[PDB]
Design a protein around this nucleic acid. Structure first.
Ligand SMILES: Nc1ccn([C@H]2C[C@H](O)[C@@H](COP(=O)(O)OP(=O)(O)OP(=O)(O)O)O2)c(=O)n1
Ligand SMILES: [Co+2]
Ligand SMILES: [Co+2]
Ligand SMILES: [Mg+2]
Ligand SMILES: [Mg+2]
Length: 870
DNA sequence: GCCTGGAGCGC
DNA sequence: AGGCGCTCCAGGC
């Protein structure tokens, strides 16, 4: 023959200009150049694929009644061949009778049956999804994407090595990739598995933008990028993260580079190119883009701002070869990340903002916040006003560029820190979806691609793509009534391991085993074998076991362990995510009856577990969906854990796969209400001993809509409660401090910082009808209608309550911090805070404590108690 | 007092 | 472009 190997990373298509074709960009070894180069493979002839559902008896449309002659594959074949094919302009077409299974929303479809498969060019017309005929009642695949068909049929599951049999060269190059080939047909393409993945060429960039003096615009005057041509994903980030780097700067228009700048750059030997203009930077950049030809281009908030502005600034400055951004040669340049992903199609865009939004939690996900919390370092924020100045002296521009060179070094280390790539890879290789799509976030799609591959492989007719917070549509998890109170004696936290994924298998809940048509469907007959969905979850559970069982190995490749830990986490998020999409109204595999059955059993399973743990003379004090809080009443740790391993074993004993576990043990517990509670957690260390760490749940103290001053104050009180000290020593400590907090708010010693209450706007400040009494929206209209920047939906506004001298309600007395200090009439509303922030949280924390209460707390805070109740 | 919805968390 | 469960706080009548 003649075959070649290529590792793909991104797949693209243009169902409108080139139906039937799918472009795949990846990497290829060039033995002569001892290195992987980019590579584009063109796959032609991916034919539509439709299934026609035969009727029991033939029908006649002009009457809408039966005829009497049964149907056969010959019948249908003919009707299409004769009326259908001919009428919709179908020239060539091949068919064949096949047998397919189905288990979905479309009633009047047999679980199994014989369809007439039909394949014809993607170029020919595409039929009406609702078509019907003399011989057939329905027809699927009528709109199946070319990239779907290809991926499903070839059993491709995310990045992996492919074999292209009988490749063709191309005279006219269509991409910007070093290598290019063409595949004559979908089946010349074959997945291979015994091959390690190839390193990647990753480029980390950052940019600076300046608004112009006269005309309104966003001119990019600088750009930094770090580069690694060997950034592996089947192993640990590299040390260093980059191998080479480049800088570029340009004067906006009406400014000159300080003098001696050229010679100060030559002086300190920095790889920085001084660009004479905006176009000269854009063109210098695309030039580099194209030469380093990075598979993965990383940045900060890319699909939101940074990218939109890079492409529009190439449209304005009429830059040379815009697509050199992406990997495909193209002519027109779209605009608004759809229009954007496409501009970079063939290349993967890692956005450290959205990735983190997915791997951890923070108050705000903007770089500075992220660098700090993740790298444990401070990041200098340089305003756009200080910029024009910087250009006055050679030292300042050199700093604004050493600054942009840093961001690109936080982003590549932020990325490098969370293993966002080696993780993304696997989440994909597990669901078989598309990696670039993964890094773009979204669980729902990844689910779909996992069930499709599942259902194809198992000869199922998959549901056609549908071309188009809410009120709960069915019962969910169970919450046990909490036995409010403070606990001194040890508490046992027993919590089920993957309660939903397990429940799905344990009871064989699957599209293919549960009978359905609001009611809770009946569990499948234990006779049936494992449906597909369960069998899927099982592979996950099994492969995961295999890994956590490899981690126990000795004299093993050290770094491997970091890896095994990633796959394992992936093997879990996956599984636990399966449940969700089952209940999502827009998920291709909507199936409400199942999602219901799954939580129906969970409720049941959690109830019994409680009834049991009680028939065991142990008091259950709280339970949330699948967890159990037990009061051991023992102060003897060793004794707890045994009581622990005991309950476990008595429970596990009840299921084939379900398994509960000692999730943990609390030194003391403050249980306020459902979903709200504090706790000292037990973290054993060197045997015979342990150390304690405080864990808060649902407390106002955790939320964002409260001022520090209160959260702090609240925090301390919780701290003293779970504390060791006596009850009287605590009540005292609490009184002592509150008192002090009051007085310190009255003598304005409390940094206005604290009072600063924060909130976010779900709509733009102008979108509100009853705006006036909403302090966060009202303070925003000020800002928006006062200075430059403008607050819009999704943003948080900082305000504080003051004394207007307008006897208006507190709500209507919200001023930006800035405005409180810069004006003299505005004074902080000590009265508000002491009674609308501090006394409402501390009060609730103490509700169960004897010795502290509403009325007492007020008097302490220096408020008028008489106005309060117990 | 009675009865909605967002926020925002928990799982 | 995954569920439902529970405070709480507003708000309209
Ligand atoms: N973000 C979440 C968290 C939980 N759940 C549902 C499905 C879980 O099966 C069940 C229990 O929540 P857990 O926090 O206990 O998650 P798991 O039980 O699945 O894992 P673990 O074995 O660690 O308890 O609640 C969910 O739908 N979405
Ligand atoms: Co409500
Ligand atoms: Co009210
Ligand atoms: Mg659990
Ligand atoms: Mg749980």
């Amino acid at each position: 023959e003649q075959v070649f190997h290529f590792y793909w990373l991104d797949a693209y298509e243009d169902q409108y200009n080139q139906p039937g074709v799918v472009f795949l960009f990846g990497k290829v070894w060039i033995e002569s150049a001892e290195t992987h180069v980019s590579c584009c493979v063109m796959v032609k002839n991916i034919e539509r694929t439709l299934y026609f559902l035969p009727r029991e008896m033939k029908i006649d449309l002009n009457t809408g009644k039966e005829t009497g002659t049964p149907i056969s594959m010959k019948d249908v074949y003919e009707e299409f061949d004769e009326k259908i094919a001919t009428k919709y302009k179908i020239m060539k077409f091949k068919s064949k009778p096949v047998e397919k299974n189905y288990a979905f929303e479309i009633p009047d479809v047999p679980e199994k049956s014989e369809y007439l498969e039909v394949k014809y060019s993607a170029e020919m017309p595409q039929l009406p999804q609702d078509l019907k005929g003399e011989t057939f009642s329905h027809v699927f695949g009528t709109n199946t994407s070319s990239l779907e068909l290809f991926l499903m049929n070839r059993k491709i599951k995310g990045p992996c090595w492919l074999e292209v049999k009988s490749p063709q060269l191309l005279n006219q190059p269509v991409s910007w990739c070093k290598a290019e080939a063409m595949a004559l047909k979908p089946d010349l393409v074959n997945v291979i598995k015994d091959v390690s993945p190839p390193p990647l060429v990753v480029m980390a960039f950052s940019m600076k933008t300046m608004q112009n003096a006269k005309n309104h615009q966003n001119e990019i005057i600088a750009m930094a990028a770090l580069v690694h041509h060997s950034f592996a994903l089947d192993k640990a980030a590299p040390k260093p993260p980059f191998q080479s780097h480049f800088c570029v700067v340009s004067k906006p228009k009406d400014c000159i580079f300080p003098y001696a700048f050229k010679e100060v750059i030559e002086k300190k030997n920095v790889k920085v190119e001084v660009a004479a203009t905006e176009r000269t930077l854009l063109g210098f950049f695309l030039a580099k883009v194209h030469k380093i030809d990075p598979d993965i281009i990383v940045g900060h908030n890319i699909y939101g701002f940074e990218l939109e502005v890079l492409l529009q600034r190439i449209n304005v400055c009429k830059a040379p070869h815009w697509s050199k951004i992406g990997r495909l040669k193209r002519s027109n340049m779209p605009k608004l990340g759809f229009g954007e992903r496409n501009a970079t199609c063939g290349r993967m865009i890692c956005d450290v903002e959205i990735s983190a939004k997915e791997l951890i939690r923070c108050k705000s996900y903007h770089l500075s916040e992220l660098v700090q919390q993740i790298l444990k370092t401070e990041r200098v924020v340089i305003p756009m006003e200080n910029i024009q100045n910087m250009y006055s002296e050679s030292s300042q521009l050199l700093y604004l560029l050493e600054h942009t060179w840093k961001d690109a070094k936080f982003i590549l280390q932020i990325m490098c820190e969370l293993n966002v790539l080696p993780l993304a890879l696997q989440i994909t290789n597990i669901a078989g979806n598309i990696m670039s799509r993964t890094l773009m976030g979204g669980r729902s799609e990844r689910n779909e691609f996992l069930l499709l591959h599942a259902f194809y492989e198992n000869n199922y007719i998959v549901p056609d793509k549908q071309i188009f917070r809410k009120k709960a549509a069915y019962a969910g998890g169970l919450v046990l009534d909490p036995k409010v109170g403070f606990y001194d004696k040890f508490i046992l936290l027993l919590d089920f391991n993957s309660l939903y994924p397990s429940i799905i298998q344990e009871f064989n809940i699957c599209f293919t085993t549960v009978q359905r048509v609001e009611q809770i469907p009946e569990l499948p007959d234990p006779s049936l074998e494992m449906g597909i969905l369960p069998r899927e979850i099982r592979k996950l559970v099994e492969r995961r076991k295999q890994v956590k069982q490899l981690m126990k190995q000795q004299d093993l490749n050290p770094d491997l362990i970091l890896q095994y830990d990633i796959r394992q986490k992936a093997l879990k998020l996956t599984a636990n995510s399966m449940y969700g999409c089952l209940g999502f109204s827009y998920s291709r595999f909507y199936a409400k009856p199942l999602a219901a059955l799954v939580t129906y059993k969970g409720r049941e399973i959690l109830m019994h577990t409680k009834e049991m743990v009680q028939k065991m003379n142990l008091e259950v004090i709280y339970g949330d969906t699948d967890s159990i809080m037990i009061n051991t009443n023992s102060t003897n740790l060793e004794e707890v854990f045994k009581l622990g391993n005991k309950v476990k074993s008595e429970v596990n004993k009840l299921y084939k796969l379900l398994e509960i576990d000692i999730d943990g043990v609390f030194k003391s517990l403050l249980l306020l209400k459902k979903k709200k509670y504090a706790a000292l957690v037990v973290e054993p260390t060197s045997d015979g001993n342990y150390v304690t760490k405080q864990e808060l749940k649902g407390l106002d103290i955790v939320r964002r809509d409260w001022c520090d001053l209160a959260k702090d104050t609240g925090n301390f009180v919780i701290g003293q409660i779970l504390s060791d000290q006596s009850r009287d020593t605590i009540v005292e400590n609490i009184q002592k401090r509150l008192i002090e907090i009051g007085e310190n708010v009255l003598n304005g010693s409390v940094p206005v910082s604290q009072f600063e209450i924060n909130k976010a706007l779900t709509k733009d400040p102008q979108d509100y009808p009853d705006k006036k009494s909403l302090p966060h929206v009202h303070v925003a209209l000020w800002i928006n209608s006062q200075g430059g920047r403008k607050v819009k939906a999704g943003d948080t506004v900082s305000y504080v309550i003051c004394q207007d001298g307008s006897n208006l309600t507190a709500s209507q007395r919200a001023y930006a911090p800035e405005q409180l200090q810069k004006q003299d009439n505005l004074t902080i509303d000590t009265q508000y805070y002491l009674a609308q922030q501090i006394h409402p949280v501390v009060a609730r924390i103490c509700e169960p404590i004897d010795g502290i209460d509403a009325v007492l707390i007020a008097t302490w805070l220096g408020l008028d108690p008489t106005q309060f109740r117990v």
